[PDB]
Amino acid sequence: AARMMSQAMRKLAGNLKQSNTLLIFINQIRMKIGVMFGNPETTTGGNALKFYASVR
Amino acid sequence: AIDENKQKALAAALGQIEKQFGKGSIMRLGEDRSMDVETISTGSLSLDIALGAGGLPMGRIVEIYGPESSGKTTLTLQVIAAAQREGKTCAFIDAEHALDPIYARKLGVDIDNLLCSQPDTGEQALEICDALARSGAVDVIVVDSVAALTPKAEIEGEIGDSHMGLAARMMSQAMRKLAGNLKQSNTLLIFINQIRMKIGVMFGNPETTTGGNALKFYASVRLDIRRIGAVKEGENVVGSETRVKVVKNKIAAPFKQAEFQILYGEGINFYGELVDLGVKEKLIEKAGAWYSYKGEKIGQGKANATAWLKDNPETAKEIEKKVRELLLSNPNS
DNA sequence: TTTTTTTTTTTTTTTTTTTTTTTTTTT
DNA sequence: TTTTTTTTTTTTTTTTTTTTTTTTTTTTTTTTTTTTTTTTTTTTT
Ligand SMILES: Nc1ncnc2c1ncn2[C@@H]1O[C@H](COP(=O)(O)OP(=O)(O)OP(O)(O)=S)[C@@H](O)[C@H]1O
Numbered sequence: 142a143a144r145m146m147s148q149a150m151r152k153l154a155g156n157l158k159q160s161n162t163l164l165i166f167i168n169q170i171r172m173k174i175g176v177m178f179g180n181p182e183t184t185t186g187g188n189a190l191k192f193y194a195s196v197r
Numbered sequence: 198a199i200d201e202n203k204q205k206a207l208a209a210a211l212g213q214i215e216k217q218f219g220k221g222s223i224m225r226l227g228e229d230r231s232m233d234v235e236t237i238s239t240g241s242l243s244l245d246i247a248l249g250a251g252g253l254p255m256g257r258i259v260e261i262y263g264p265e266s267s268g269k270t271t272l273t274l275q276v277i278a279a280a281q282r283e284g285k286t287c288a289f290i291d292a293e294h295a296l297d298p299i300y301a302r303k304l305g306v307d308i309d310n311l312l313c314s315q316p317d318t319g320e321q322a323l324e325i326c327d328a329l330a331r332s333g334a335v336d337v338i339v340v341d342s343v344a345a346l347t348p349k350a351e352i353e354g355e356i357g358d359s360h361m362g363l364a365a366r367m368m369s370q371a372m373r374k375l376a377g378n379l380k381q382s383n384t385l386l387i388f389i390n391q392i393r394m395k396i397g398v399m400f401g402n403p404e405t406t407t408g409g410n411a412l413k414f415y416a417s418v419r420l421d422i423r424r425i426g427a428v429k430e431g432e433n434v435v436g437s438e439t440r441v442k443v444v445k446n447k448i449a450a451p452f453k454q455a456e457f458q459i460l461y462g463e464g465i466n467f468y469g470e471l472v473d474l475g476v477k478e479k480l481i482e483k484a485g486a487w488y489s490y491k492g493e494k495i496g497q498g499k500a501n502a503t504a505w506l507k508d509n510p511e512t513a514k515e516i517e518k519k520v521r522e523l524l525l526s527n528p529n530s
Numbered sequence: 531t532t533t534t535t536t537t538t539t540t541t542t543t544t545t546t547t548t549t550t551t552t553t554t555t556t557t
Numbered sequence: 558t559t560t561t562t563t564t565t566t567t568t569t570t571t572t573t574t575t576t577t578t579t580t581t582t583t584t585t586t587t588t589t590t591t592t593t594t595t596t597t598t599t600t601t602t
Pocket residue numbers: 264265266267268269270271272297300437459461462
């Protein structure tokens with residue numbers, strides 16, 4: 142799933158900007174395990190989307 | 198026309214499931230005989246009536262709880278004794294380390310065929326239950342005190358060390374694993390449990406049980422047993438007056454109760470019940486403190502009336518038969 | 531006029547997933 | 558200023574690695590259910 146997302150971010154970013162299109166992704170929350178520091182809350186579908194998003 | 202394509206689609210899907218997982222994987226509920234409720238005796242006739250379906254269900258989990266010296270162990274040894282008499286194999290996991298085998302023999306248990314285990318940890322005790330279930334060769338397993346099922350980490354650690362929710366987590370895992378295996382083997386699992394008090398609450402009951410919440414969900418029957426008085430021969434205390442309450446039931450209506458006598462050395466008083474059921478069903482006449490059967494006077498006081506039913510087995514056989522016919526809602530002759 | 535001959539050598543990684551469980555009275 | 562105008566494979570190996578030490582940077586819930594208890598009868602001295 143992460144690898145599919147990572148590939149879709151690369152393909153989309155350029156096309157959205159050229160068309161002037163806004164893309165909104167809704168995400169759900171999930172718990173991390175083996176975490177003593179910080180928040181145990183994660184989001185779903187990998188890390189690519191945290192880099193490519195302009196607003197979270 | 199559309200009905201036909203749906204019947205085929207269903208038949209194909211049913212075929213694919215049975216291939217992938219085995220023959221009995223999915224059936225119509227009406228044509229599945231493994232799903233029928235079979236029961237065994239408790240040793241008390243009044244309890245067999247209170248349970249509704251004539252006894253405790255095979256292939257299920259059962260919980261018996263109550264205060265100290267209420268008769269919990271004695272009641273489970275009477276279940277084992279009755280099952281052994283019908284040529285069933287029985288195990289006793291003694292986590293309390295407090296079973297007396299001479300008393301077990303006096304109650305009618307075949308000591309020589311009873312499989313016994315005194316395990317070191319809670320995990321060892323529940324792994325033996327899983328092993329004996331999967332075997333297919335054991336009918337009744339008793340686990341004496343959930344309260345004494347100590348996890349491994351708590352035995353290795355020292356007194357004072359906090360292990361919050363560790364025993365509860367172990368019992369949740371055990372239920373998940375045991376439930377499926379007990380049903381396939383048609384094995385009855387009885388858990389004995391102790392009462393503890395819950396602090397800082399005035400609304401509802403302050404009584405609770407050890408071992409967390411899983412066992413309340415998975416149990417098909419939960420019994421609350423309590424000592425409600427003494428049985429005397431003038432001065433000498435010879436036994437206990439006992440009340441069992443059916444607090445959860447999934448094979449018949451709950452919230453019925455049973456009253457019977459536990460006599461020290463003998464166990465449950467069968468003929469004592471037979472009088473009380475005979476009086477209730479108009480088969481025995483009572484004139485104050487005098488008992489009578491078909492005109493003739495059998496005795497005066499419950500003890501003499503019970504002593505009359507001992508040395509007249511013909512009348513005892515007759516009354517048992519009629520009480521069984523009348524009151525048992527699902528007889529199995 | 532007169533007639534062909536014979537292969538060579540690899541390149542480079544991609545991406546996380548998901549929570550479990552109560553415990554015990556005090557005058 | 559040339560033409561070929563149709564190709565083949567036919568079955569493989571590797572011969573056992575490093576890594577060479579991780580991150581964090583502080584969160585939240587957003588307000589529950591209870592659902593009705595027993596005790597079983599002590600002692601003073
Ligand atoms: N070996 C024995 N001989 C005579 N009476 C006994 C014996 N063991 C138990 N009893 C009596 O039978 C009655 C019920 O005892 P149990 O069946 O042990 O009840 P219980 O709830 O298992 O009690 P625990 O495990 O000690 S909290 C009590 O009055 C006991 O004194």
